[PDB]
Enzyme design. Structure first.
Site: not given
Lengths: 52, 377, 364
Positions: B256, B267, B281
């Site tokens: 999460s 990224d 998750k």
């Protein structure tokens, strides 16, 4: 180090269906130092890409 | 009528019953069947469950404080929260919590397990864990003593300027705590975020933490299916530490938010994720009131990383992957120098760096960043 | 109307869910949830499953799949697999590029039973030779040993092993018992044998019990609820019996055991049974659909239900890792002492059979 409970291959002689031509992970895992060198090179690559 | 088939089936049950129950029960077991047969995380809330879940809230009834999730259909705990009684016990991530209170938990809604963990802090509760490492379905009990702990804390490193910074759960002021701790040590030129074993947190803090280290910013995208309802987060311009080298740590016990912040940096090429794959998750759920005195719990949006990928199943694949283990130590004393030779507590210690390798490789990956930085003057 | 709840819920699941599913797949996902949540055994059969079930011996090799590898434990003599001499470890490498070794489901489920006339050249490989081989194995409908009489070594007792309650077990039992008719003892072996035709269980029970009620199937409907009552033509009303049950015995194999026990007409030796006391008849609901649902329960002559409760054997005993065989004793055509000593359950069955013979004599 590695963590595993069952063989990745079904059997050592089943399910598997010029070696010097390039390094392979089986020899890298034998020498931690070469692995650390590759990790340092990867960090260098990421840092260099951060300058784009 | 496309709707006919259901009523046609239920009519058959009415006349060829083996039990004795009205159509109310056949409908109740129909809806609850649908949700559990659609996605793992959803659940039904009847009048009583909705009433007792709508308003109740207190710190004492937190319980063990561990977090739970679904692997593929077999329930598994994701990670015990650091410092809780379960953490001090043998509870480890990746295990299947087969039963709670000697009650078969198989095929039971996850929110029911979450409620079961709740209770008076001083109450013993048994659990039948299943560890894939061992052949015995071990069992053990532990008291529900609730502990509140801000996992944020900045620990320096003995012989290097690099700062150890563990974030094992995003409380309401994680961003403020980490900002203050980092500001307290301006001399440092490195951060090794130990997001390892961090089950998750609230998004409005992970987004802030990611914004702390990024200038332009496209952090996450809570899209869903309604194009009009899609939401995209962008980090504001201010970035107090937009140049510090970073190195994050992730293991299967983090999901999460713990892969929202780790995934966001990876990224933007703003850090190097070290460790091993995460749980994944990558979905959000809301409590939608459906009908009178009832409600349901259904996933409404999946989290999207800047590159367009999804955390729902793939998780984060760290750039440098190494499994935990003790660091190899020197064993031999060579004859480097001989005769006729020429002449002329409150901080992270080398011991705690040595016992575990995942923190030894994260500090090493900071040294290479420092070297590359010095090459550019 | 009463369909307000589901109609109101299906709207939310149509607007808020993230994958934008249609109203047909949701309904197929709704009733499927109903049956699975109604009773454990209930299942939903769509048109494809309808034709599958509508339209039979297996290959017979015990695919143990131990440690993933398809290790054959014991082939069935009725199939050509035994004739070929299939040894342990023989693997079905693949049918068509599916890598069946990873998870063997489709082959056994729908190639061995369905269309048994399939050309059997399915990558014949052995443990000692992973390469493809040719062994001229043939496949067809296979007879099963639903009745297996091995007599005994030196006593007038007939070992009777029934592996499946098929429609012909009763006649085969009659023939076997009529063979060596002078024997005055019988040992039923229901270890395993998950079930079979209820009428067959009633027939086997009638073969011994005289007049009492064997099984009741009341269910819920006031009508139906047909009883089964014995008939006066019970041939053997006094021959000793000792049936062996296990966790693998249920359905037919546990209504015969339950009926004998309630009449005090035999000795139940073994461990607790599974408790498959439910009859589930497929019921078409649409032009090309059907649903399997529990329809009736089995009540015993005493009245106790065959639920997961099962049956409590009179003489509880386990197969035994170490029978009484090596404790410092010294100072193929029938059942010899070897396999009698191999397991303690059969030893105790024979032992309890003997006491019956002695009690017969004290009173005669």
């Amino acid at each position: 180090p590695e963590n595993e409970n069952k063989f990745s291959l079904k059997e050592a002689d089943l399910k598997h269906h010029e070696e010097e031509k390039e390094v392979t992970p089986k020899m890298i895992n034998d020498d931690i130092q070469l692995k650390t060198a590759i990790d340092s090179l990867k960090t260098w690559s990421i840092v260099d890409e951060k300058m784009d | 009528h496309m709707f006919s088939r259901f009523s046609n089936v239920v009519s058959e049950i009415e006349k060829k019953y083996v039990d004795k129950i009205s159509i109310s029960e056949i409908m109740t077991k129909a809806i609850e069947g649908l949700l559990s047969n659609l996605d793992a995380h959803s659940a039904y809330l009847n009048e009583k469950k909705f009433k007792e879940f709508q308003a109740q809230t207190e710190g004492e009834f937190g319980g063990l404080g561990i977090t739970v999730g679904m692997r593929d259909g077999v329930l598994t705990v994701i990670a015990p929260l650091e410092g809780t009684p379960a953490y001090k016990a043998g509870v480890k991530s990746g295990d299947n919590i087969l039963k709670i209170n000697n009650e078969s938990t198989l095929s039971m809604s996850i929110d029911d397990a979450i409620n079961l963990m709740r209770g008076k802090p001083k109450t013993p509760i048994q659990i039948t864990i299943v560890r894939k490492n061992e052949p015995k379905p071990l069992v053990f009990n532990i008291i529900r003593d609730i502990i509140k702990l801000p996992s944020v804390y900045v620990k320096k490193i003995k012989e290097t300027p690099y700062l150890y910074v563990r974030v094992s759960g995003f409380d309401k002021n994680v961003t403020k705590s980490v900002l203050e701790g980092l500001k307290a040590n301006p001399k440092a030129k490195g951060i090794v975020l130990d997001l390892r074993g961090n089950p998750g947190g609230l998004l409005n803090q992970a987004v802030g933490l990611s914004n702390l280290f990024i200038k332009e910013g496209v952090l996450v995208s809570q899209k869903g299916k309604n194009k009009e309802e899609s939401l995209e987060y962008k980090a504001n311009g201010r970035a107090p530490y937009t140049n510090l080298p970073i190195a994050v740590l992730v293991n299967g016990g983090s999901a999460s938010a713990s892969e929202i912040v780790a995934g966001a940096l990876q990224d933007h090429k703003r850090a190097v994720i070290i460790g091993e794959k995460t749980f994944g998750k990558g979905s959000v759920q809301m409590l939608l009131p459906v009908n009178k005195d009832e409600a349901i719990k259904i996933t409404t949006a999946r989290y999207y990383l800047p590159s367009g990928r999804t955390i729902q199943a793939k998780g984060i694949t760290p750039d440098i992957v190494i499994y935990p283990g003790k660091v190899p130590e020197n064993e031999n004393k060579f004859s480097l120098k001989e005769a006729d030779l020429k002449h002329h507590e409150k901080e992270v210690t080398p011991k705690m760096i040595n016992d575990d390798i995942q923190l030894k490789t994260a500090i090493d990956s900071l040294k290479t960043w420092s070297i590359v930085d010095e090459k550019m003057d």
